[PDB]
Amino acid sequence: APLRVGILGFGGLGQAAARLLAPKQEMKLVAVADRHGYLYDADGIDVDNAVQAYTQQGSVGKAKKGQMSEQSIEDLIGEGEVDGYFLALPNLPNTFMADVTRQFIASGWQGVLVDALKRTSAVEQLITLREDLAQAGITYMTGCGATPGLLTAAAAIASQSFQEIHQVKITFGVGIANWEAYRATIREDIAHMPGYNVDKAQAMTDAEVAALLDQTNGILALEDMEHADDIMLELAGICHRDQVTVGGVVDTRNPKKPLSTHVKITGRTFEGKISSHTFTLGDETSMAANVCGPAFGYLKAGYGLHRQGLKGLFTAADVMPKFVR
Amino acid sequence: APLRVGILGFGGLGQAAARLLAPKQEMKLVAVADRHGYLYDADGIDVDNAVQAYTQQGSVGKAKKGQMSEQSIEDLIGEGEVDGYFLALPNLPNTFMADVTRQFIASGWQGVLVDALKRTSAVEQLITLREDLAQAGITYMTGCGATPGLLTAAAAIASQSFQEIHQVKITFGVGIANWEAYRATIREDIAHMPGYNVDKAQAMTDAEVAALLDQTNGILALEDMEHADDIMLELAGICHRDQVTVGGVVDTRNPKKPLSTHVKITGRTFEGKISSHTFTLGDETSMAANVCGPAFGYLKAGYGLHRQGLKGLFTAADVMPKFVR
Ligand SMILES: *[C@H](CCCCCC(=O)O)[C@H](C)N
Ligand SMILES: *[C@H](CCCCCC(=O)O)[C@H](C)N
């Protein structure tokens, strides 16, 4: 009885999430939705077919068993049996994840939701929905990506050695392999550039983008970003959000990671000695793998909590993710 | 309402565990026991007084409010209100932790137990007690030290990026500051030397020890050890125990850590790329801090699970520890 799961969003992240699920024996992808269509197959999605439909014909509604629809998310919820969904949605507008969650609250569907949100303020909009989620019978796992997520959890574990936390420093690197199937979401990173914000970045043209990325050989270096690692670690009682600082480099013109992603956790131990733990990711673990891997680990953990009748909102920092086989 | 906790064992580890609890506001040490005596103080232990009694007069039963007893563990259980205990016991004989747990099962006391066991086979003896523990109303957290524990949990998190795990390699270093208050437990490490075993190591004299440690300037280099990280990660469905290999260096003649403790997690991602995550501990995080810190993090996590009516046996690999303030 493998977990029947769905993906909402079929840009680069959701496509990678679909590929990641293929060989799992204990997780079965039955449901995808994009803006313009949805695909359900209780016997398991043809990812080849769905990625074809999307990239060639603009939506998975064009897939062999696909349905076109401007209510894809509303239609797919009531369409068949899905234990959990990964919300691989961009947060555009900044309310969209919260709005999609309100559709899930409103639908009377129960089960597990996971996101890979990045921005403190989007995670806050989901905090306000804590009781709504509980009451609806939904276990919601928020910030269960790479950062927040994998790295947030690593810091939460690392923190146990210390009487007091001083700094959680996250430095991430990202190399874009395929420009096509990232330039849909590149504006989420441009929004973290100094001078910019989501509204300004989202209104930019392919031209205004390429004109910016030309200034640096396709390198976005983003400094002290709005990253929900800060509140997740604070709700877990580890440190104040202000002691969490997140920074990153994306190389748009190189598949190779421009630096080793890591989290440095600094604190003082009970003996009054000050020291740092360091969790480093392999350079050949892609963004897709470091996001979607934890995402479905959390989805499985979420189902464990859901099954025991534990509902509400959980962060990467609160629960141990479960290896999906 | 801080958690009322106890320590069983007052060698080096339990003494450090007591010091670690002092400044906590949300955890109150009310109970210690050694072989020959016990100390209870519902208003909070005088650690200065207890460490004095133990080191100077041979037992904490000699402490200001102490009681001498050859049934210290049996007497302290029924003595007052304790939410959880850290079993800072050496596993000597190899059944002792399991035997103490049977006293706890038998006592009809309910709450949280945590250990920092090291040996796969001792952790197995506690697996056999799974239902006994559940039925008794006890949440038992096993292998919640440094390794197994902190490092086991780190690997469990790290594993999420990968379709398949190849190797979990743990390399640990330990520098002994105070020879006095380690030579009580040094024989647990000597047992991992090649030729040796617990029975042979435990029968050794201060002389036979010093004659061994003289051969290497006080350096035990222990290779492919029996370490319960292997079964904990297997029960968590991450990998086979045979893909977990644990090795270490203790420098008996230097407080300074003889190498950086770390865990290397190697696997293949869904894209077929092979890579390693690396979790490294600060050189100035002591053994005491890397053991007792996670131990009480797990004790708190254990109370969270206990409070929700979740009983049975949990490993470091199964649950997120909770920062104790
Ligand atoms: C979010 C950060 C991507 C995570 C990097 C993880 C890794 O090292 O693979 C992006 C900037 N949208
Ligand atoms: C168990 C290993 C001690 C853990 C080392 C952790 C660190 O780096 O502080 C000993 C060998 N009894």
> What DSSP line would sit under A143-209, residue for residue?
S-BBTTBHHHHHHHHHGGG-SEEEEEEEEEEEE-S-STTTTTTHHHHHTTSTT--HHHHHT--HHHH
**Closest ligand to the CA of B188:** 2
Q: Do residues A274 and A102 lie in contact, with contact meaning Cβ atoms separated by under 8 Å? A: no
Q: CB neighbours of B310 closer than 8 A, spacing ≥ 6?
A: A308, B139
B46 touches chain A (CB under 8 A): no
CATH level 3 topology of A150-281: Dihydrodipicolinate Reductase; domain 2 (3.30.360)
* Coil, helix or strand at residue A277: strand
CB spacing of A279 vs B277 below 8 angstroms: yes
CA neighbor of B156 nearest in space, from B2, B302, B23, B318: B318
Tokens standing for residue B1: 């309402």
Query: Given the structure tokens 């523990």, which residue do they identify?
Result: B133
* R_g of chain A computed on alpha carbons: 19
Give the Cβ contact number of residue A19 at 10 Å: 17
Give B-chain residues touching A290 at CB under 8 angstroms. 161
Tokens standing for residue A143: 């910030």
Nearest residue of A to residue B146, measured between CA atoms:
A161
Task: Report domain A3-147+288-315's class.
Answer: alpha beta
Q: Nearest-CA distance from A78 to chain B in Å?
A: 30
Q: CB neighbours of B146 closer than 8 A, spacing ≥ 6?
A: B116, B172, B261, B281, B287, B290, B291, B294
Ligand 1 environment, Cβ below 6 A:
A 118, 146-147, 172-174, 188-189, 248, 250, 261, 281, 285-287, 290
Q: What is the DSSP letter of B20?
A: H
Nearest residue of A to residue B290, measured between CA atoms:
A161
CB spacing of B271 vs A293 below 8 angstroms: no
Catalytic residue among B24, B74, B166, B188: B188
Give the Cβ contact number of residue A258 at 10 Å: 18
Q: Do residues B69 and B38 lie in contact, with contact meaning Cβ atoms separated by under 8 Å? A: yes
For residues B241 and B317, what is the distance between their CA atoms, to the nearest angstrom?
A: 13
Single-letter amino acid code for the residue at A64: K
A108 Ramachandran zone, left/alpha/beta (phi>0; psi -120 to 50): left
A188 is catalytic: yes
CB spacing of A236 vs B318 below 8 angstroms: no
Residues in chain B: 325
CB spacing of B294 vs A161 below 8 angstroms: yes
Q: Nearest-CA distance from B117 to chain A in Å?
A: 17
First to last CA, chain A: 13
Give the Cβ contact number of residue B134 at 10 Å: 15
Helix A150-158 and helix B150-158: axis angle, to 10°?
180
CA distances for B107 relative to A240, B104, B136, B167, angstroms? 42, 5, 9, 41
Query: Given the structure tokens 């109370």, which residue do they identify?
Result: B303
Q: Do residues A300 and A324 lie in contact, with contact meaning Cβ atoms separated by under 8 Å? A: yes
**E-assigned strands of B131-163?**
138-142
Tokens standing for residue A259: 């630096």
**Own/partner pairs, A52-59, CB within 8 angstroms, 24+ separation:** A54/A10, A54/A15, A55/A181, A59/A34, A59/A35
For residues A298 and A310, what is the distance between their CA atoms, to the nearest angstrom?
A: 14
CA distances for A151 relative to A167, A248, B110, angstroms? 14, 13, 35
> Where do breaks (C to N over 2.5 Å) occur in chain A, by preceding residue number?
none
Give A-chain residues touching B163 at CB under 8 angstroms. 20, 23
Catalytic residue among B28, B62, B79, B118: B118
Give the Cβ contact number of residue A241 at 10 Å: 17
For residues A128 and A230, what is the distance between their CA atoms, to the nearest angstrom?
A: 17
Q: Do residues A276 and A266 lie in contact, with contact meaning Cβ atoms separated by under 8 Å? A: yes
Query: Given the structure tokens 């990325």, which residue do they identify?
Result: A213
Q: What is the resolution of this structure in A?
A: 2.3
Instruction: List residues bridging with A244 in a β-sheet.
Output: A168
Interface test with B, best of A3, A308, A320, A325 (most B CBs within 10 A): A320
CB spacing of B157 vs A153 below 8 angstroms: yes
Q: In what order do the strands lie in the sheet with A84-87?
A: A66-68, A37-40, A27-34, A3-8, A84-87, A111-115, A138-142, A312-315
Query: Given the structure tokens 């995080």, which residue do they identify?
Result: B285
Query: Given the structure tokens 């747990």, which residue do they identify?
Result: B101
In a mutational test of the pocket of ligand 1, which residue from A185, A283, A290 has the highest number of ligand atoms less than 8 Å from its CB? A290
Q: What is the DSSP letter of B146?
A: B
Q: Do residues A254 and A176 lie in contact, with contact meaning Cβ atoms separated by under 8 Å? A: yes
For residues B76 and B8, what is the distance between their CA atoms, to the nearest angstrom?
A: 10
Q: How far is the CA of B219 from the centre of ligand 2 (A)?
A: 14
State the greatest distance between any 2 C-alpha atoms of chain A, in Å, as a whole number. 64
Ligand 2 environment, Cβ below 6 A:
B 118, 146-147, 172-174, 188-189, 248, 250, 261, 281, 285-287, 290
Could you state, in order of their start, the residue ranges of all structural domains in chain B?
3-147+288-315, 150-283
Nearest residue of A to residue B261, measured between CA atoms:
A277
CA distances for B40 relative to B60, B78, B115, angstroms? 10, 11, 20
Residue B239: phi and psi, rounded to 5, are -165, 170
Q: What is the DSSP letter of A242?
A: G
Helix A12-21 and helix A47-57: axis angle, to 10°?
170
* Coil, helix or strand at residue B38: strand
Interface test with A, best of B320, B322, B324, B325 (most A CBs within 10 A): B320
For residues B110 and B131, what is the distance between their CA atoms, to the nearest angstrom?
A: 14
- CA-closest residue to ligand 2 atom 9: B287
For residues A88 and B315, what is the distance between their CA atoms, to the nearest angstrom?
A: 31
For residues A268 and B289, what is the distance between their CA atoms, to the nearest angstrom?
A: 10
B163 touches chain A (CB under 8 A): yes
Catalytic residue among A62, A192, A227, A311: A192
Helix A120-127 and helix A96-107: axis angle, to 10°?
20
For residues B101 and A320, what is the distance between their CA atoms, to the nearest angstrom?
A: 26
According to DSSP, the β-strands at A84-87 and A111-115 are parallel
**Rounded to an integer, what is the distance from CA B67 to the centroid of its chain?**
26
